[PDB]
From Swiss-Prot:
UniProt family annotation: Belongs to the LytR/CpsA/Psr (LCP) family.
Topology relative to the membrane: Single-pass type II membrane protein
EC annotation from Swiss-Prot or TrEMBL: 2.7.8.-
Protein's organism: Bacillus subtilis (strain 168)
Annotated compartments: Cell membrane
Protein name as catalogued: Polyisoprenyl-teichoic acid--peptidoglycan teichoic acid transferase TagV
């Protein structure tokens, strides 16, 4: 794998196929990587972010999570590219079953639970504030809990991804890493190859998620129509700064 800076879009979905098309995405996280300098940046995109869908020149803006339901992963990737004004080099898609499999193959994940709460199992699951080691079913319930936006959900999703990054960065047995990466990636849709993932693990060996520069799409709650359809309207000057920051990290000029 070349050491050129590159980006990954992580898509979390429920249904790969429904309603004659695809399902809406629930989780959208972009990571940019500068391997020559061992750096990373991370940005989640709220599911209700009001955007123009890629290729929809004559249409009205809609929620970004509808992109996957209106053209699949290709439409989501291109819509995110247009929104962030960066190329999306790699993608990872996971549905609920695939996500649980990933978590179980790495032997669970460590997260700092913010408060006590119990959720239903997709198969009661109790979470106590403080450190917890979750299996796949528990990690899915953690990611899905909702208690008018999805901000806490996005926070917990980024927590899960940070924990996965920390697990891969702290691993050492490269042959063990090879087999764990083969097993854990069997049920995700991706254009990242096993060799690329092993190279990335080697480059970021000893990295830690605290070092990731986490950016934010700031904006406002917006209720459109007499039915008060909820949208997250992105702040334009913040979005311009996020764009410039990701572009600089990627050595990409629009």
């Amino acid at each position: 794998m070349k050491k050129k800076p590159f980006s990954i879009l992580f898509m979390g979905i429920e249904d790969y196929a429904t309603k004659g098309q695809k399902g809406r995405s629930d989780s959208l996280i972009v990571v940019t990587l500068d391997p020559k300098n061992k750096t990373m940046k991370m940005l989640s995109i709220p599911r209700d972010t009001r955007v123009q869908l890629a290729g929809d020149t004559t249409g009205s803006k809609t929620k970004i999570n509808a992109a996957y339901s209106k053209g699949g992963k290709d439409e989501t990737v291109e819509t995110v590219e247009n929104f962030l004004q960066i190329p999306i080099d790699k993608y990872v898609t996971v549905d609920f079953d695939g996500f649980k499999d990933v978590i179980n193959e790495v032997g669970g994940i460590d997260v700092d639970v913010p408060f006590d709460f119990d959720e239903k199992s997709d198969v009661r699951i109790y979470f106590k504030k403080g450190e917890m080691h979750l299996n796949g079913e528990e990690a899915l319930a953690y990611a899905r809990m909702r208690k008018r936006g999805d901000f806490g959900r996005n926070d917990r999703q980024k927590q899960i991804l940070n924990a996965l990054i920390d697990r891969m960065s702290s691993a050492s047995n490269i042959a063990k890493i090879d087999k764990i990466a083969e097993k854990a990636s069997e049920n995700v849709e991706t254009n990242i190859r096993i060799t690329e993932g092993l190279a990335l693990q080697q480059i970021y060996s000893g990295f830690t998620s605290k070092k990731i520069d986490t950016l934010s799409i700031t904006g406002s709650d917006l209720y459109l129509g007499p039915n008060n359809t909820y949208y997250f309207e992105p702040d334009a000057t913040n979005l311009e700064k996020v764009r410039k920051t990701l572009q600089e990290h990627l050595d990409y000029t629009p």
